[PDB]
Design a binder for this molecule. Structure first.
Ligand SMILES: O=C1NC=C(F)[C@H](O)N1
Ligand SMILES: O=C1NC=C(F)[C@H](O)N1
Ligand SMILES: [Fe+3]
Ligand SMILES: [Fe+3]
Lengths: 423, 423
């Protein structure tokens, strides 16, 4: 088995590094003063970048691969998407869900993703998708640590037996309690639904991840209740507010007041660039707002924010290959995080910040941690992002679980020339 | 030499097709009723998509690869970009320009791009970059047909000897007359500069491509003068309005009135998604406008619109590998052209529509045309876009000028499995 990763570059560090492995864990990390020779049991990073695994903090594996079934989301809105999904949800079968979830999970393994948080719609008395996903979680465990969010897609108080079904999902083993306050019939139901969500999370000792204010409504401020309840309960690390796209439309004075609470609360934020740019701004004519939450300001304020893919060929998103560098690319452009350092540091949005969002306890290139790491054939985050590089090797427990032999491009000029798009 | 392209899918057509080649041209195109066997002199498209070459209708090869030299565009605005470029322009040398232009051109050849329109800043008494680019045009001719736009970056009337230098550039051989009305000191200089641009285009029988209303100013309406002058002169096919980002901010009533003229005029439009999403909206706080011109409405109205990359690692854009499918991906998201058919038809925005913008006379998979075509390892435009596929083969004059052996990804589950991200 592998004993060392050599010739590795690490974000924020100068030079090359060697990562020693023992019993499936990282035993030590030592700097190199030059290039080390390869040998059996040594995986050569070849002066590429070594980082802990990519993370998918927000995806819907129960809906993945169902776009157009039985109908397409014509308007490209969150609301029609939920209606189209309702039609598909009525046709779910156990094997259907497992097969589609596994198809996307394999793309994720290929893309160096070893941690995934999937929401699963539990506004369904049969809990068909949840039962299937709980089996998938066990089956995929050797390659991906899958967290399941009990997501009451049609509301907690606004759907028949919504609260009972949400609790049933937790009793069956869901890892995270979800909610969707802006979809509840009234603002009061929205606020009350959050009190119920927090009570369930404390009763069962589970994490929280709310689909929060995913709407271009400047009056949708459920995020302040999520943050205040987390602060009151002293549980910010365990709480996440997904989307918060309404924040894109808030006035600046309220946002400034709010940011103090967001920081004090310690809660996490997920932005979903590919889906947000598509679903938000649909009620504007021109000009049209971008609709992504205030990622740049969160980073400047030290508030933990990260990026998810959200949908992969489903009612809310017709594209995708479950590639986090592609998600990152979209987010950096739409959020205008286009300075060299902002782009280079972008990898944090799909690695460390996402691990914090998932409350991971064994993550990072550090002595004592499990030997879970990936190798990118690039010099730094900027280079990896610019060239949209594949994952050369994905290592888990000290063993290679995925590898990509890069494409080879040649142009035939006066003489053949290899093109790698580098400078 | 190659005699046939077999097993080809064609956009908008059912089944498979065979493209017969003779003397560097396409002699005939015949439908197949099944898969044809390979043989020597036959290039097998392997049921992939065959299309005429990708086109780059708007790039700046004189500024490519200079981002951060001598300083970075900190604000990420058009205006600071021009100031940073001015600093770099003072340091230009003949060989400097040729080397950087050739580096990006090689990436373009690798990416199946056989037609490129580069703007070159002629607000420079020495015309250093233009002289270098005229040599590059001749040198790259076997692989790319390069058009050069004499672009008066600092204005025609607002820069010393601007008009004389613009005309000098045409006398030296520039193919297209440029302008930048919104950067002129006054609205009157802007309008007058367009009369001068059209007079020069008619005097020298050249095309026109104006950097038009690239500003989030609802009062920047130079596009109506570009279209009206083209209509008056009966030369719409030879005229292009690049950017028109101000159109994103116009009221709908004026836009409706304007669209009648745009259609009647027959002029072309270029949108530059990667750069527009980055440079536009920089003066907004929140919400923030997207800033791309009205691409969706132009398509619905039958107005020719297409996409350019604009910058590749320069003062206005820190990223890029000169990849048109990546440009297309950004445009489809920001413009909300996310319906299945809209995405599938997206290839037109980087092939046929761009060829029309460049007034190309030998373009398309048709009998009698030069055998210039590329093969994408994908089933249709949607698939090519979703998976961001490379160009498997680029053929020019019936000869292969570029090829890419695709990457090979494997996941090691209970058994090794190849992953191609297809369904
Ligand atoms: O409520 C939602 N359901 C599914 C989505 F993809 C979107 O994140 N929002
Ligand atoms: O005026 C401009 N110069 C260069 C650019 F990249 C931008 O297209 N606009
Ligand atoms: Fe979601
Ligand atoms: Fe330009």
């Amino acid at each position: 088995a592998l004993q060392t990763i050599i010739n590795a570059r690490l974000p924020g560090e100068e030079g090359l590094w060697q990562i020693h492995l023992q019993d499936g864990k990282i035993s030590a990390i030592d700097a190199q003063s030059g290039v080390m020779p390869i040998t059996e049991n040594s995986l050569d990073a070849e002066q590429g970048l070594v980082i802990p695994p990519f993370v998918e903090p927000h995806i819907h594996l129960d809906t993945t691969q169902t776009a157009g079934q039985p109908n397409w989301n014509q308007s490209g809105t969150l609301f029609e998407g939920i209606e189209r999904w309702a039609e598909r949800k009525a046709l779910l079968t156990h094997d259907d869900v497992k097969q589609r979830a596994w198809q996307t999970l394999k793309w994720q393994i290929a893309n160096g993703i070893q941690h995934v948080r999937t929401h699963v719609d539990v506004s369904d008395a049969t809990l068909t998708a949840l039962k299937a996903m709980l089996e998938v979680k066990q089956e995929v465990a050797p390659w991906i640590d899958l967290q399941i969010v009990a997501f009451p897609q049609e509301g907690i108080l606004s759907y028949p037996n919504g609260e009972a079904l949400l609790e049933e999902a937790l009793r069956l083993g869901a890892d995270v309690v979800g909610a969707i306050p802006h979809f509840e019939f009234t603002r009061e139901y929205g606020v009350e639904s959050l009190h119920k969500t927090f009570a369930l999370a404390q009763k069962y000792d589970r994490l929280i991840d709310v689909h929060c204010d995913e709407i271009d409504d400047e009056q949708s401020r459920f995020v302040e209740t999520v943050a205040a309840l987390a602060h009151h309960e002293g549980m910010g690390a365990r709480v996440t507010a997904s989307h918060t796209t309404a924040m894109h439309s808030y006035n600046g004075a309220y946002t400034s007041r709010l940011f103090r609470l967001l920081k004090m609360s310690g809660i996490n934020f997920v932005a979903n660039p590919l889906v947000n740019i598509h679903l938000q701004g649909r009620f504007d004519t021109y000009p049209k707002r971008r609709g992504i939450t205030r990622v740049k300001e969160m980073l400047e304020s030290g508030i933990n924010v990260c990026f998810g893919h959200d949908g992969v060929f489903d009612p809310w998103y017709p594209l995708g290959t479950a590639n986090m560098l592609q998600v990152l690319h979209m987010g950096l452009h739409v959020c205008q995080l286009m300075g060299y350092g902002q782009i280079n540091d972008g990898l944090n949005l799909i690695t460390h910040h996402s691990a914090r969002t998932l409350n991971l306890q064994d993550y990072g290139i550090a002595a004592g941690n499990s030997a879970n790491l990936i190798i990118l054939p690039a010099e730094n985050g900027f280079d990896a992002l610019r060239r949209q590089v594949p994952v050369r090797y994905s290592v888990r427990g000290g063993k290679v679980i995925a590898s990509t032999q890069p494409a080879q491009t040649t142009v035939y000029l006066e003489q053949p020339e290899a093109i790698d798009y580098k400078r």
